[PDB]
Design an enzyme around this catalytic site. Structure first.
Site, PDB file in Angstrom:
ATOM      1  N   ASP A 192      -4.805   2.366  11.967  1.00  0.00           N
ATOM      2  CA  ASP A 192      -4.287   3.594  12.560  1.00  0.00           C
ATOM      3  C   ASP A 192      -3.304   4.353  11.700  1.00  0.00           C
ATOM      4  O   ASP A 192      -3.220   5.570  11.789  1.00  0.00           O
ATOM      5  CB  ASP A 192      -3.630   3.295  13.898  1.00  0.00           C
ATOM      6  CG  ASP A 192      -4.635   2.973  14.977  1.00  0.00           C
ATOM      7  OD1 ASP A 192      -5.853   3.263  14.786  1.00  0.00           O
ATOM      8  OD2 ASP A 192      -4.195   2.418  16.020  1.00  0.00           O
ATOM      9  N   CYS A 224     -14.876  11.245   6.573  1.00  0.00           N
ATOM     10  CA  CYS A 224     -13.927  10.613   7.492  1.00  0.00           C
ATOM     11  C   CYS A 224     -13.584  11.572   8.625  1.00  0.00           C
ATOM     12  O   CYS A 224     -14.404  11.791   9.508  1.00  0.00           O
ATOM     13  CB  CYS A 224     -12.682  10.109   6.770  1.00  0.00           C
ATOM     14  SG  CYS A 224     -12.160  11.165   5.482  1.00  0.00           S
ATOM     15  N   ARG A 230      -9.474   9.359   2.984  1.00  0.00           N
ATOM     16  CA  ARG A 230     -10.348   8.172   3.080  1.00  0.00           C
ATOM     17  C   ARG A 230     -11.671   8.297   2.294  1.00  0.00           C
ATOM     18  O   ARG A 230     -12.103   7.355   1.637  1.00  0.00           O
ATOM     19  CB  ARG A 230     -10.625   7.822   4.540  1.00  0.00           C
ATOM     20  CG  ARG A 230      -9.419   7.282   5.275  1.00  0.00           C
ATOM     21  CD  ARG A 230      -9.801   6.735   6.614  1.00  0.00           C
ATOM     22  NE  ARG A 230      -8.719   6.872   7.576  1.00  0.00           N
ATOM     23  CZ  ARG A 230      -8.809   6.493   8.847  1.00  0.00           C
ATOM     24  NH1 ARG A 230      -9.931   5.950   9.297  1.00  0.00           N
ATOM     25  NH2 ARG A 230      -7.780   6.644   9.664  1.00  0.00           N
ATOM     26  N   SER A 231     -12.306   9.463   2.381  1.00  0.00           N
ATOM     27  CA  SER A 231     -13.506   9.743   1.617  1.00  0.00           C
ATOM     28  C   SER A 231     -13.215   9.723   0.123  1.00  0.00           C
ATOM     29  O   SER A 231     -14.006   9.208  -0.663  1.00  0.00           O
ATOM     30  CB  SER A 231     -14.058  11.111   1.993  1.00  0.00           C
ATOM     31  OG  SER A 231     -14.326  11.189   3.383  1.00  0.00           O
ATOM     32  N   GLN A 268      -6.025  11.732  -1.053  1.00  0.00           N
ATOM     33  CA  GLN A 268      -4.969  12.499  -0.368  1.00  0.00           C
ATOM     34  C   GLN A 268      -3.528  12.075  -0.604  1.00  0.00           C
ATOM     35  O   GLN A 268      -2.656  12.928  -0.793  1.00  0.00           O
ATOM     36  CB  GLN A 268      -5.210  12.627   1.128  1.00  0.00           C
ATOM     37  CG  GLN A 268      -4.258  13.584   1.779  1.00  0.00           C
ATOM     38  CD  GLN A 268      -4.839  14.200   3.030  1.00  0.00           C
ATOM     39  OE1 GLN A 268      -5.396  13.507   3.868  1.00  0.00           O
ATOM     40  NE2 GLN A 268      -4.713  15.508   3.163  1.00  0.00           N
TER      41      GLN A 268
END
Length: 287
Positions: A192, A224, A230-231, A268
């Site tokens: 999370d 994502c 995440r990608s 990111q």
């Protein structure tokens, strides 16, 4: 080659890591900070067209015009060519990946049309639909064996395979009397907050995925939620794990730089950039 590339001898990676992370990640942080403007001075004209604004999950995550994926125009629409998608380079092709946002219900027809029109045979999903009570991605695929039409694309589950950290689903895709199989690789375990910890669960997924898909010549769809952090992490990771096989160097920096040029925020956060390094360090140390 120093502005857009920081290659490191694989034989030296562990020290590089040590050095890079010393002093509360001083050098890692500094390194990552050099990437903050890359790509950002490029236009996002279509993402801003009033007819496309409902097609963006996030106002501040928009596809660059030059690399965006384009759907075939539909003769009355206008922005019916539009999707939040971008071609992002991989180990194998400058156009190996089509990375995109997690579809809204509003855009899942668009999403499947992209898969179809791109001739993609593999989706990589790196998010849950719901995380901490927020919806991060529509459930764009069937819950069971009953085929479901999305636009003109009939999707049906052939089988699925559950694992500790991922579920992989083989779809049959029909468009007219035209049939394909597509595999859907769903990493279901990203925490999370923060990055996966231990990082090894992600290496295991990247290994399974790449071992399954082979040397695909057709674009792989990655997403994502925004299709950036995440990608970005996944692609970089899959790329360098192939790289070490045939090279003496890795270039995480050079890769992230190339990706930024193609879609905003590709890796990111500093935490994920560090994560990419940690995953490879595990690999190079026999986990």
């Amino acid at each position: 080659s120093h502005m857009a590339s920081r290659p490191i001898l694989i034989k030296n990676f562990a020290e590089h890591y040590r050095l890079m992370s010393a002093d509360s990640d001083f050098r890692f942080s500094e390194e990552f900070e050099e990437l903050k403007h890359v790509g950002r001075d490029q236009p996002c004209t279509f993402a801003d067209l009033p007819c496309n604004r409902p097609k963006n999950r996030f106002t501040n995550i928009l596809p660059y015009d030059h690399s965006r994926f384009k759907l075939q125009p539909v003769d009355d629409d206008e922005g019916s060519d539009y999707i939040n998608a971008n071609y992002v380079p991989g180990h194998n092709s400058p156009r190996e990946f089509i990375v995109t946002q997690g579809p809204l219900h509003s855009t899942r027809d668009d999403f499947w049309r992209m898969c179809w029109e791109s001739n993609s045979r593999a989706i990589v999903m790196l998010t849950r639909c719901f995380e901490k009570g927020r919806e991060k991605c529509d459930q764009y695929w069937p819950n069971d064996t009953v085929p479901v039409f999305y636009g003109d694309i009939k999707v049906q589950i052939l089988n699925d395979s559950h694992y500790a950290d991922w579920v992989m689903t083989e779809f049959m895709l029909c468009r007219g009397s035209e049939q394909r199989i597509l595999r859907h690789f769903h990493f279901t375990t990203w925490p999370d907050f923060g990055v996966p910890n231990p990082p090894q669960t992600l290496v295991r997924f990247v290994r399974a995925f790449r071992d399954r898909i082979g040397a695909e010549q057709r674009p792989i769809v990655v997403h994502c939620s925004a299709g950036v952090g995440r990608s970005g992490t996944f692609i970089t990771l899959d790329r360098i794990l192939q790289q070490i096989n045939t090279s003496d160097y890795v270039d995480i920096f050079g890769i992230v730089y190339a990706m930024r040029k193609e879609r905003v925020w590709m890796v990111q956060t500093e935490q994920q950039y560090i994560c990419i390094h940690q995953c490879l360090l595990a690999v190079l140390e026999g986990k």
